[PDB]
Amino acid sequence: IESKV
Amino acid sequence: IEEEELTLTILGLGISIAGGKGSTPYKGDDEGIFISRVSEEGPAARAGVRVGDKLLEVNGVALQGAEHHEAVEALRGATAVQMRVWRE
């Protein structure tokens, strides 16, 4: 999972 | 290229993060939380954050061995981001 913050 | 600890200070923020305990690793065997993406027009770029940096601490919040959601929440709750990382 990749989260852009 | 070997490891070096640095503190990066950021002012979205154009970083994607990957990994974490109990989550799909970012690389090989490491369960750490990593910078997966850096968008050239973000405060983190001008702060010098780099793809592959391993997150160790976000504003006192220890992320070594933290789960993914912990890092997401720590990052949103941090104007100034003293971001401690390990870089190769």
Residue numbers in the entry:
A (entry chain B): 257 to 261
B (entry chain A): 722 to 732, 737 to 803, 805 to 814
From the paper:
We determined crystal structures of SCRIB PDZ1 bound to NS1 ESEV PBM (A281-R219-T220-I221-E222-S223-E224-V225), SCRIB PDZ1 bound to NS1 ESKV PBM (A281-R219-T220-I221-E222-S223-K224-V225) and PDZ3 bound to NS1 ESKV PBM (A281-R219-T220-I221-E222-S223-K224-V225). The NS1 PBM sequence ESKV from the Hubei strain was originally identified via a phylogenetic analysis that identified a mutation in the NS1 protein from the H5N1 virus; the avian virus-type PBM sequence ESEV (which affects virulence) was replaced with ESKV. The SCRIB PDZ1:ESKV complex revealed hydrogen bonds between Ser223ESKV-Ile742SCRIB PDZ1 and Ser223ESKV-His793SCRIB PDZ1. It appears that the conserved His in each domain found on the α2 helix, PDZ1 H793, PDZ3 H1071 and PDZ4 H1170A is an important position even when this was not obvious from the SCRIB PDZ1:ESEV structure, whereas in the SCRIB PDZ1:ESKV and SCRIB PDZ3:ESKV complexes a clear role for this His could be identified. The PDZ1 mutant H793A abolished binding with both the ESEV and ESKV PBM. Our ITC analysis of the ESKV PBM revealed an interaction with SCRIB PDZ2 (KD = 9.5 ± 0.7 µM) as the tightest interactor, followed by SCRIB PDZ3 (KD = 12.1 ± 0.9 µM) and SCRIB PDZ1 (KD = 30.0 ± 0.9 µM) as the weakest interactor. SCRIB PDZ1 displays a higher affinity to β-PIX (3.3 ± 0.3 µM), compared to both NS1 ESEV (21.4 ± 1.7 µM) and ESKV (30.0 ± 0.9 µM) PBMs. SCRIB PDZ1:ESEV and SCRIB PDZ1:ESKV superimposed with SCRIB PDZ1:β-PIX with RMSD values of 0.77 and 0.75 Å, respectively. The −1 position of β-PIX N645 forms a hydrogen bond with S741PDZ1, whereas the NS1 PBM does not interact with SCRIB PDZ1 from the −1 position; instead, the −2 position S223 appears to be the important position, forming a hydrogen bond with I742PDZ1.
Scribble is a highly conserved regulator of cell polarity, a process that enables the generation of asymmetry at the cellular and tissue level in higher organisms. Scrib belongs to the LAP (leucine-rich repeats and PDZ domain) protein family, and features sixteen LLRs (Leucine-rich repeats), two LAP-specific domains (LAPSDa and LAPSDb) and the four PDZ domains (PDZ1, PDZ2, PDZ3 and PDZ4). The influenza A virus NS1 protein was shown to bind to human Scribble (SCRIB) via its C-terminal PDZ binding motif (PBM). Examination of the SCRIB PDZ:NS1 complexes showed that the NS1 peptides are bound in the canonical ligand-binding groove formed by the β2 strand and helix α2.
